[model samples]
Target chain A: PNSGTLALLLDEGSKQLPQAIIIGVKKGGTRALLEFLRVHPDVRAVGAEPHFFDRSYDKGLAWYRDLMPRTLDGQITMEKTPSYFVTREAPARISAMSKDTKLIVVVRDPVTRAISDYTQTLSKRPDIPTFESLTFKNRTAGLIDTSWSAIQIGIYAKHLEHWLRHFPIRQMLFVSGERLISDPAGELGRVQDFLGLKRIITDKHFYFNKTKGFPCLKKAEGSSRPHCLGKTKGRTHPEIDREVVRRLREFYRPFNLKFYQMTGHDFGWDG
Target chain B: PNSGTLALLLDEGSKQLPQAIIIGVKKGGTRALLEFLRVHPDVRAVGAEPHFFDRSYDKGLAWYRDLMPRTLDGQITMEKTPSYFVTREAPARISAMSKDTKLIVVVRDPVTRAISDYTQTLSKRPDIPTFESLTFKNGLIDTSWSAIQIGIYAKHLEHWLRHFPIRQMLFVSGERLISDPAGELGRVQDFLGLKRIITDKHFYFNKTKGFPCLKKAEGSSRPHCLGKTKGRTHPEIDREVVRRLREFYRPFNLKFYQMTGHDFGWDG
Candidate 1:
């Protein structure tokens, strides 16, 4: 079908709750995944995080359903709310909505993920404590402050335990954050297969941005200008001490292994 | 009044849900504190963990109330269930029972506490996995293990904090309960608004048991050490495992200290 025709057909669909959700680890490239999936004609997604499972749960399911985008009978409606992954009640709340709800998680090396999380926080709040200071409760003792959301969110195994109690492993897919940059098409292909969509989003749709050190969509259906991620997406991370990085890697090693065991995939994050 | 006469007078009290509870971190000398407190005149307690707020909530308050020993007026009713500390719903469930309920937590150094926890478990199930093997997964500390999870005091305390004010809860040092039982008990008595009757005279160190023993039995004039299980020797754990576990729990311990505003000096 032509680009104009596909647009007209999308408007004909009805609004529906997301069949799939990117329940996440923040700064793990959730935005990139959601935006990539938006290019698929069979996928319809809400652009904003509804936060129905966590902060706004009291608003009720009717309020949540209203936030989703319209989808055709066969199209998958989706939303990405990274906070839902760590929210204690999220798994149960999501399960109550539908036992069969498909969950997607974008996972990166937790050490890097924590740093990325801190980097983003530093951008908005300059007065905040340094990453090294916030990372440890007692630096002399080498105690990691896991209470910090940045560190806490990267405990993927702990979060997965909450979700696994409510949903089967088959009901969720974990997309690699590292792979998403180096090989966007391959990772999206897996996402498409999991969502039961045809291989419509392929290699031709992406071009490597050497400067950004990530992939960018070659073109949108109607727009002539190529769509790159926002300026904030490729912000430079501040330099961290090597010893601090080493300790974080050690801290996350056991958790990363457990996450690998649970998902049945080796993400090779230890090295 | 005489001891027998006092015992007969104690039978005149009514049953009530716990006015105070030792909602806990297990293997942290709760039994010693509870047993020691029984020597006090103005305290009535249950011999068993009711687990009303965690495991037995569905059993209803009436069922839980029936388990308490009778108390005369001015007596505090209390029970100790250490598992409540780590339980996710314990704080909310406890608050529902009574918002003003006093909570006591006996805390120890988490590294030693986890080892102690594993030691108790190992004694029961000899066929269980090795402590070092069970403690870590792929060279990383495994937190899913109950021993490790229960030691995350700050994480569990945060859950309780959501339901109860800090003033309503008391954090007792398990180490202090051993080194200075009377001093710790004095604080507990003040928290419960009871007179400090169970003073230094009530406690004497038993070299054989390696823990303090009560100068008098609950209702009799005989010296009483805790049961044989009170001071069981912990098996030697791997030095490396202990070191790593200490590293794992350092942040949580510091956070717990910061939250409670009283440093127990476990870090040293």
Candidate 2:
């Protein structure tokens, strides 16, 4: 579409998609990240997970953009779709939508990220076998089944190469998931700077509940109520053998190094 | 070198060489480039051209490191040896010394750079033949003249590019380095990830010198500049020779511009 036409469609809520999307590492605290960012006055994040790139991409661009939340002219409309980072086609499609769109990626310790991912699905469907059963082809031999869903997304370097093909790596900012939990305000400060908004979100807005073991926003952006993620989050992960965890950590090591080299902030995940 | 002895040797100042080096295109203002950089408090550069990679590798890296200026704890020792940029063996040998050393290459417009090089050498050796007489061979090329070969930057880049990622090298516009010395010096400093320590106040544009002089030249008694020979007047070439040389350089200038996105505005 022409610029004038594209401009008009974007103005109306019909092209509901925001200028930015949290294309991500799922369960890497994308939920917590979205919640903290919502505290910013300029931020208008879609409350729902819009699976536009995966489940609903068949719904067409007009349908997809319409899924976005309407925001004030000065506010930024954003949505989190974590699966886009792993999908091979998401980078090109997102570029076609807007090449200049800024990207935010949140990374955690790869082993923890993978375990969180596996723990997420296995909890609801307890019919799933032990993580060791799915994680290794020969459990005792410790040959990692890298094709498993949990391990594949942790190959951050492999997925980043595809995105880098379409967007300059400098356009992307990597937020540490570990920091988002340990220091919410410190993380939010960086996010605000990357988005070029004022640093309105501060430590006063966050209160870490010793009982919940995760930080919560004390004041929601617009609503009367303050809240945290539902009980589904911070679920106690099923314990896995220490040997399996150590072996998988070894498997993720080299990919983690390359990711650090490409991004220039090692995050010291290797240590 | 054993690991323990190597660690000890590295700690000593006499074994210092570089965390960076300027590999070049001669007459591309490399002298003036290194001089302005040496003024930076964090930089210490060797004054002489040590052709260690090509001519003196047999003297060994220990000897090569000994040639470097001893640096303070935080200061970087740097050197410029222009001939290293073109030599076939230089890139690999330099990489072996330190795969991590940053590179700076100063490039000027090919046509003028060649003329200046020829003019300087012509004055030095009256025995040398004329530029037009020595440069072209059967209207194609004269493989012997270093002046013409060095300007084919894309060809030389292939040698350097193979050994170094493009990010590690900073290409300074030799033309801008002359006209806007401080402005370009800021870029050089910024590329080195150094603070903006070198600024407009550090430079003095001499109308008579026809080039920039440092505000402080390596702890001089007063503001000093490069010797008279630098930024010298180029010998007047035959008008026909200028036309032919531009035509000869036209194809490669296009290639060089394509290789490096920065246009020196060499083409008329």
Candidate 3:
């Protein structure tokens, strides 16, 4: 079932199968979520992001399935490509592959998500204008494209509506970025339950360092440790004002509530 | 000037240039070196690997230059793309852009490097056969062509020699893989004549850690960490047989010494 020349060569003698996937909303907690899920004894996640569904879907389902190991009893094979969330045809294409597939989505507050996205882009282009000005200017010009102002891409209401049209709310699990940072274990437990697995994950799996203001998985001795960045570390510009934060909260309020109602949980992000 | 679409955008404004570029020997301490250079006041290293000369060179020199920020007085702009070491046309392509461009190469003990490369590929494909089987089988038949065996260090080294003079090349000290990372870094400073500008300033940078810590200017925080790997831990593969394989690389080491005017000091 593998597609194309290389996949055909690689998938020789392998049985074809299907697996669950994490289609992402970028700048969210997708990486951390994947890392946490990897520790689950019953889960097997791929090492790198397999952009199979969006970029290489044409490579065929057999090719995508071959990238995964042969599935064992009670084990779920998984691959993640964060960019698939934005691609126009991902939902229908993914649905066509496996109707029973469980999809995991981690979303962040759109304004902050967009700002983080722009900063990543700016780190490569140091000469780019400040994030705030670029965002505002681009918004007015109707040129607020993801390539130009990547921050605006996370307007969840818009993107989620596309997925909701194709995939049922029951098959999808939406996680809040703030809740993931503040309480990873609780969110992970809910995710494990969604996957029809036991809630075996404990707080021992979480490592929250005050300095980084983020959580990383604990590693073995002699293994590399994660480093925290200073205030200016990953940012291309200064912090946004509280007023701007309030405005974004107001804009996202209705959608956030809808997300909460759909998931049956409160994200507890106070404005 | 920045390259590709960036170059066209820059024609609308000002032009600043980078002094040298890092044509890399991939997985050979390029990440650590790039992180260190990024903090230097007089040095500006781009964040991502611009595979310009090898794959994207068709994008044109103006496109490449446009990626660089306006250079401050006496500042050097650099880019690191490790695959460029084995890339055939990179040397002449880079040479055309800047004749005085300094090239930095980091070399690992080929035997250990090959094993490391194999492990990385295996992590992606856990269902694959053992490393020894893959390497030996791939060698016997031209079927799969495993990247692991390509650590035939001699062939890649010869590729670089065809382009740049021995003087412009800085062979990075890779054996100091752990114990003396700073001392190896000192060689880079001395090569670039950046000692006075950067001074003996240091915080903490570790290779095995595979992540960069915060710089003095950035305060006490770490950024730019590697993404996490699931269930798989970094395995310490057997280096006993690998040590024996060192003999295969002996002739190349001698040739490297004669060409570069420095002893690598390997005991094999």
Task: Give each candidate's fraction of reference contacts reproduced.
Answer: 0.00, 0.00, 0.00
- Model 2, B150-186: lDDT tens digits are 8878789988889988888888989888888878888
For candidate 3, lDDT tens digit of each residue in B125-185? 8787665555454324222453543554456667666766777888885666334555666
Of candidates 3 and 2, the better by DockQ: 3
* All candidates: TM-score: 0.49, 0.48, 0.44
> What lDDT score is found at residue A72 in candidate 1?
47
For B1-268, candidate 1 gives per-residue lDDT tens digits of 3332233334444788899999887999899889887765466678888787888889888899889866545567899998988888888888998999999999998877887898888788888888889998777888888899998889888889999999999999999999999899999989988766566755656654577765444543334567755667787888998888888888888899999998988888
Instruction: Count steric clashes of candidate 1.
Output: 1
* Model 3 stretches with alpha carbons more than 4 Å out: A1-18, A137-152, A220-237, A241-246, B1-268
- Model 2 ranges with Cα > 4 A deviation: A1-16, B1-268
Q: Which candidate number maximizes lDDT?
A: 1
What does candidate 1's lDDT look like per residue over A166-249, in tens digits?
A: 999999999999999889989999999998876657665665555456676643422222356766676688899999999988
Candidate 1 residue spans exceeding 4 A from truth: A1-12, B1-268
Clashing pairs in 1: A254-B140
> How accurate locally is residue A250 in candidate 3, as Cα lDDT from 0 to 100?
64
* Tens digits of lDDT, candidate 3, A78-127: 77788888878998888888777778888877777777877777677879
